[PDB]
Amino acid sequence: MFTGIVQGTAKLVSIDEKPNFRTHVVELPDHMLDGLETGASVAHNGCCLTVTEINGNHVSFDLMKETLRITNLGDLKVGDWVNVERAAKFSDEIGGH
Amino acid sequence: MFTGIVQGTAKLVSIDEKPNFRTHVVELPDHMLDGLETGASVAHNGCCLTVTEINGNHVSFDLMKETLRITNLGDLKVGDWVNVERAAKFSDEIGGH
Numbered sequence: 001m002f003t004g005i006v007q008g009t010a011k012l013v014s015i016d017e018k019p020n021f022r023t024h025v026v027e028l029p030d031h032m033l034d035g036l037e038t039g040a041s042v043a044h045n046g047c048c049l050t051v052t053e054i055n056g057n058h059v060s061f062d063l064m065k066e067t068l069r070i071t072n073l074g075d076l077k078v079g080d081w082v083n084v085e086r087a088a089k090f091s092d093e094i095g096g097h
Numbered sequence: 098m099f100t101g102i103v104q105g106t107a108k109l110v111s112i113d114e115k116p117n118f119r120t121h122v123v124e125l126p127d128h129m130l131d132g133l134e135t136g137a138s139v140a141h142n143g144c145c146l147t148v149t150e151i152n153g154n155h156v157s158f159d160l161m162k163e164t165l166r167i168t169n170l171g172d173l174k175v176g177d178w179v180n181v182e183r184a185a186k187f188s189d190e191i192g193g194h
């Protein structure tokens with residue numbers, strides 16, 4: 001199975017470039033501002049990465065430069081928005097339905 | 098669980114715009130040229146869409162204009178590449194890794 005369907009979108013507003021790692025920050029909309037936190041895994045259109053820090057409604061994520069070229073993450077540009085979805089490192093997974 | 102990890106990438110080479118639907122074509126690399134076919138579901142960085150047609154190594158996919166704005170698919174631009182992964186409409190037993 002697979003849906004690639006996103007809970008909501010994010011607005012690229014700032015790029016943070018560190019010679020050790022690349023960092024990108026987006027602006028979380030009203031329905032993604034709630035629940036998300038640092039260390040969370042956000043998938044941008046389906047590419048999972050973790051929150052390095054939250055700048056209020058904004059969230060910076062970490063991104064390896066070679067991973068950026070290897071992935072299609074490098075394509076991101078500020079002023080654009082991203083399909084963002086919340087991912088969890090671990091879950092109880094009782095079952096439910 | 099969630100990985101957002103892509104089998105390989107695709108190069109946007111042509112956009113096909115139809116007033117009824119928007120169409121986008123990418124260039125499939127050597128390890129994605131094998132196996133993929135029209136009517137298949139490719140996820141571009143994790144957004145699943147179906148192949149409208151294959152142009153040799155290229156593949157055009159369908160994309161609704163409002164879906165494009167609602168998603169972050171509209172962000173695509175020719176000359177760029179995309180994280181592309183193969184998805185199947187149905188499987189005997191999730192026999193896909």
Ligand SMILES: Cc1cc2nc3c(=O)[nH]c(=O)nc-3n(C[C@H](O)[C@H](O)[C@H](O)CO)c2cc1C
Pocket residue numbers: 041048049050061062063064066067068070071073099100101102103
């Ligand atoms: C659970 C998970 C989290 C990941 N997080 C990131 C990330 O925060 N930044 C990144 O550039 N790649 C991330 N990746 C991509 C992966 O670690 C690796 O970089 C690519 O698969 C190959 O470059 C993640 C992959 C997985 C499975």
Ligand SMILES: Cc1cc2nc3c(=O)[nH]c(=O)nc-3n(C[C@H](O)[C@H](O)[C@H](O)CO)c2cc1C
Pocket residue numbers: 002003004005006138145146147158159160161163164165167168170
């Ligand atoms: C299985 C599946 C396939 C989808 N295929 C496409 C597609 O080919 N083109 C597109 O613009 N959206 C596609 N979507 C997105 C979805 O149908 C719908 O457009 C968005 O969730 C809301 O606009 C697909 C969603 C699912 C679950």
